Amino acid sequence: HMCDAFVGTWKLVSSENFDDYMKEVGVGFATRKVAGMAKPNMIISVNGDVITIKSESTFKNTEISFILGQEFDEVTADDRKVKSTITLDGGVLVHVQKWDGKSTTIKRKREDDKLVVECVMKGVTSTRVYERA
Numbered sequence: 001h002m003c004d005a006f007v008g009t010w011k012l013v014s015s016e017n018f019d020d021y022m023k024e025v026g027v028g029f030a031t032r033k034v035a036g037m038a039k040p041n042m043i044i045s046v047n048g049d050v051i052t053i054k055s056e057s058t059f060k061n062t063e064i065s066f067i068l069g070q071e072f073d074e075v076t077a078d079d080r081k082v083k084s085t086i087t088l089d090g091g092v093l094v095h096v097q098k099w100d101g102k103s104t105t106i107k108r109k110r111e112d113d114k115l116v117v118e119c120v121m122k123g124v125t126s127t128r129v130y131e132r133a
């Protein structure tokens with residue numbers, strides 16, 4: 001019953017500072033342009049201890065399945081090969097990605113009827129807001 005409030009189908013409705021976040025991560029020009037246009041749907045489901053987060057967009061489709069606290073391999077939409085660990089901290093899903101000596105943290109939380117995604121790379125934050133589809 002952990003992540004019940006996250007489960008569902010969500011559509012991107014707003015994004016702030018995402019180009020600067022992608023720059024800080026190392027995403028190249030063309031990917032930033034095309035990725036920045038996309039309006040993904042995020043589909044979150046839970047089956048036992050396994051959480052699945054799917055992103056479907058015109059840019060890329062991605063899918064991760066994981067158990068909280070248990071590291072896994074992830075291929076990001078920008079084609080990084082990262083080692084990811086996702087935990088629940090005070091009701092917030094906290095997703096750390098490690099690659100090439102770098103790290104980024106993505107937090108996902110419920111706020112009113114929205115699902116808010118905060119992506120941080122060093123001093124740079126981007127906020128992406130999703131509503132139920």
Ligand SMILES: C=CCn1c(-c2cccc(Cl)c2)n[nH]c1=S
Pocket residue numbers: 022027031035040055076077078106117119128
């Ligand atoms: C998962 C975190 C942010 N995100 C992305 C994303 C993440 C990394 C690189 C790229 Cl190109 C896109 N697409 N939709 C969201 S929300």
